[model samples]
Target chain A: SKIEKLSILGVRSFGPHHPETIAFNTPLTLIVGYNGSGKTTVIECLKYATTGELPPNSTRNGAFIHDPDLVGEKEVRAQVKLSFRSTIGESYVVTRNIQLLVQRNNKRTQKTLEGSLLLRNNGERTVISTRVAELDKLVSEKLGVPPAILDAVIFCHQDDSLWPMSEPAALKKRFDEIFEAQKYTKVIENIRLLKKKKGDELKILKEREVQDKANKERAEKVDELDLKDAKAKYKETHIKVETTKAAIEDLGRGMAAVDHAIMQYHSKMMEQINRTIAELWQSTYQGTDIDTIQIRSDVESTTSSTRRNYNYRVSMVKGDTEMDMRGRCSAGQKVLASIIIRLALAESFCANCGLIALDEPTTNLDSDNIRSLAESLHGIIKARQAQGNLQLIVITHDEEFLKYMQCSDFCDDFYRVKRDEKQNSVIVRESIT
Target chain B: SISVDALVQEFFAQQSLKILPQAPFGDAVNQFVSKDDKHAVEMFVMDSLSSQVRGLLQLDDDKINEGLDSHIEDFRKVMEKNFLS
Candidate 1:
């Protein structure tokens, strides 16, 4: 679902006396503001309503409310209303209200914030939920996107400095998160258990087979008692051996089925990953020598044991050359790789809502890289929006980067935020193009 | 940090995945192998060929004894030829 409108009243920099409302019926929405103009405040309010969580580095819980007026009034209320249209063509209104209560706690008095949230779905007249937790739950369920993943897709931090792919283990962890690698790890563990069971069963059957031979030899002894006991033992062992052999065969078939599945699963996953990486690099790394990337796993063993080691390696027609460069990619190269990975991730995994937000993404990137990044974004945005309704929200202070985004003819709506004479943040200007 | 044991376990899992119903006795061969290559191979051959040997044996008690020693000798000879070759 994408936001149709957002309104804030009695929130910091926005007051009940003069509320703020924004309409976001655009593919690409830009909110440009100088530092301390409270541009992030709008994002924070949306974050609270959608996720019911405070922004990172927030000073206090009630920091959201315009406090000077509340200090004099002894109590104040702030409200956030979000109106969005779901993918299924249903309309929703999610509203959250925070009550700033100034009350005495034993000896000292303190201000505390308490809140309630409510939702109305599909133009329904009745409210769906009045509890904060349940309201967000209803919103997520109706929208079909979980909040945790929504955060990953829709909230890019300002402090995402320096590419983390500079380290091998870190790179592994990041990709693992995208691919849900834990599921494959679980498959490996379950296979080990099955192998152990089969091994044990085979050991028992072999022992019984050896025991049958000994019983047969004892049946030929001179003593009648020994012969009688040996004959009985031999008969029982023979019956067990037949049944056990059939079972071992069953185990063999099962193992083979799982083995084939493993190979197919691993191959298909790598194929898709390589395809996306190739496409991303084509746009971002124009004129680069290597046009392909591969994730390969190999078996390494000692005299007693063997292991599968996985690595992300780059290659071309020449051959697989630099595995070490994966961790040694230059800052600009890292930026290119990171953008590709995130775009791929958004395409592959964050399809539930298909909304992505970037906070100052042009930082740490050169002008050349910025152009490449803008081109890469254009391809993904057009492709994804064509597939479905995609929401792209960017909060930036870079004017040059904004122009690069326009190279593909983009940004349907733009808003510039600034402080007025009274030091109050307001949308200074708006444009549609 | 890498878990060598987990990777080893994964390797073994892949080997097991390659096993099929027709290869029921294949895992038996794997289990029978030991640290020493000579003895491991001998045990593997014996465990593997024993099933085939039984399948070829006679129903009559006397006939069972009749071909048992010869087949056992042939089994050893066949394995030795392959091992040396």
Candidate 2:
């Protein structure tokens, strides 16, 4: 679906007698305003009441620091409306609207946002059912949010400072967000399953270790038992042999020699030691640390115990083309290429996400490429209308891009933001409707 | 600020992503050893960690952005901010 524009006529903050209005249309209205102007608040409020994001983040679950200067025991009724044109079942340019209200709560020291949605087409409007408990589930799915429709993409807090995203872990987390990593319950479960198998392995190894130790101890214990038994037998014979003096002496000596012989063969104690040693060696290691480098059967590797012989390299291989990033690509080149890739992805998400919030979309982009990107983005927004429509909501305070936008009729609504006396913040603007 | 246990757990697991708690530390290292020589991944690992550290230490936005993806977890660890805020 291609949303012509979004119209937010009234909301909590600018919602005085003027009805905090903000409306967007094709050839979007560039609502440029100063700091503290509720321009960004338009989307912020949309995300807040509809999605439960916080104020600073999205005015949903986060903080809502309305200007402290606006003093008076006064109550204000705030309303917000987001309208878009969508195609239903191959339909193009149909209208859809969602609205909400933010009321101040003195007892709670908070502002509460509540709202509903109305689906419209061919001049017919219908209110979608959001039975409180099912509100989040329905709206997120209907609006294409993550964990619901799974295509919610946005860029917030853009300035000269942006976070770098090259680390593998960063990539990993991004993968989680993009692919819904937590949804891979089976993978995680498989990892958990390994625990039991490892536990059983540990138990078997430990048992073998203890068996070897027991074998050694048992040899000593058995040797003592044998000697004591031998002595007891000899004593029992002594009483009878005393009567036959010389003969008995001879017989006793023979028995003593026999006992000595018995000890040798029975001491097959060496066999026990061998068996236990074999088992113990299989599981235990005696050393603490050594940089052991071994080659895999699958991959050839060079080993080095001595320092000063290490080299690391990473490369991308595609068929006959193998490129080792030799630092040839300029920063701008990398950034522009990346922007193109992201735009491609955002376009796919447009069906559910509706818009790609791009800040400094022209940063690092040359004039020619920037123009190319604009064309590309125009196509991207159009291709994302699988079911309804999508809107590209860009929040920027850039002076340069203003020319690009204004000339293109990017402003469906023109807004001037200001702070009144008592430091109360205000947003004065036009509605696209 | 580094969790040695987690580091070791991850180090031995042979996984590029999260360390699976199920595998014994020894087996993981052995598995790594069994594949590419432990030394082969040294540069890759250090560079990864360096990228992470650089991102976290940045006070400037541009430098910070360079380290953004890598420093994210560390950033949260250091500053207590979630993905968005």
Candidate 3:
């Protein structure tokens, strides 16, 4: 079943009070709002009404922080209705009503999880009413997919477009798992525990794996049939496994090398940038020195051994650090390093997870920065789109960023703009048309 | 970090895909799924764009297990048709 439409309506000021919501499309949504408007709140409401999770870094500072204007004055039947298109030419709707469970003021707890998943044909609608979990179970049983995957594919709210670059070291572990999934975590852990439980028993098994083929290599009796065939095949299979084991091991070693290379490369790049800046300052510029240009990574590493510290470098690039951009550099230079870094991260991660989100991609970018970003990001977006690389959703308050994205033709698609005053969120609707 | 012993568990199954008539089926525990070659394990996902790797991450253990089961079956059928015919 493909979700066709989803919507939310009547929530408090969009976040606290506003409760009703809906989603009508799959591809993209771009909700825009000024400060104080319920844009962020709208997103909060969306997360809450659907999956029941709070937005990241959301402190809830507005009036909705506590009490909000009740929408509709009547319970408003506030609910989350998810409409999906079924394979059998039918539409299935799942609605979960908003409940007044934990209000700021004293209110008897009431929960609302209503709505049905019915197969509607023509004017006749057969409602499928059941527990929320049961509904999810039914969908999973039929589609061979769980609702979680649906959520990941259906929605995303990137803290920012340049999320990866800002936290490179921290992002590596996640990157590793996704790109070349070594193994499932719990299963791997269990296997580890199992090995530890019977260490010597495993040691014996390992000893057997050590092949001594010299004894058999000399006896090339191809004519004998069975033994010879087994030997030949054993040799082939053994060779392949050795090669595979070598390859898998190589990944770990390769990761270490990459880590080293990145460190060295960043050091060199920063040096060059600092040197250039120093050169610029020494020549004629006065006042302050170009303090430093920062180098950030997107790799998220959970490994305790990584020291919980990341690799970052600051370069004293041209101009006084204050006016680096000829206010010091061209819009081009300002955007150069950051844009390149982001492009690289996106490319690397695209193959593994085809979903990406962007928040305010271009903010106060200089002309050069804008130009460079346009070229690189557009190119990447185009190629990925052509090969169906990833689904990218970029949110921006600037119109130019939208144009530069050119995400529509080159990438998957973009979101339609909407706003929920109650949530104070710019409702990003699914792709229009 | 991948232990070969873990992969050896396939040997206990009624039948294992890892079985090759030519090799000696030694007594070993869980082992990694040996690819005849270095080919992928047949990436068969649902048609909807949402069934991506990240999408799979959103799922709980049950959903994920169900996905893996269905995917493996679909892959097996597809491979059989491709190989046997």
Scored by Cα lDDT, where does model 3 land? 0.39
Report residue B12 deviation for candidate 1 (angstroms): 24
Interface RMSD of each: 11.3, 35.2, 17.9
DockQ, per model, reads 0.03, 0.01, 0.03
lDDT of 3 by residue, A181-274 (tens): 2332322333333324334433443444444344245455443655565555444433333323322332233223323433444344434444
| Model 2 lDDT per residue over A281-332, tens place | 2222122221111111111233432011112222222344444322533455
lDDT per model vs. reference: 0.56, 0.39, 0.39
lDDT of 1 by residue, A346-365 (tens): 55545355676666667677
DockQ of 1: 0.03
Task: Rate residue A295 of model 2 by lDDT.
Answer: 10
Candidate 1 vs 3: which has more lDDT: 1
Question: In model 1, where do residues sit more than 4 Å from their true spots?
Answer: A10-17, A59-77, A99-123, A161-274, A286-320, A323-336, A381-388, A406-412, B1-85
Backbone clashes counted, model 3: 72
Q: After superposition, how far is residue A89 of candidate 2 from its true place, in Å?
A: 7.3
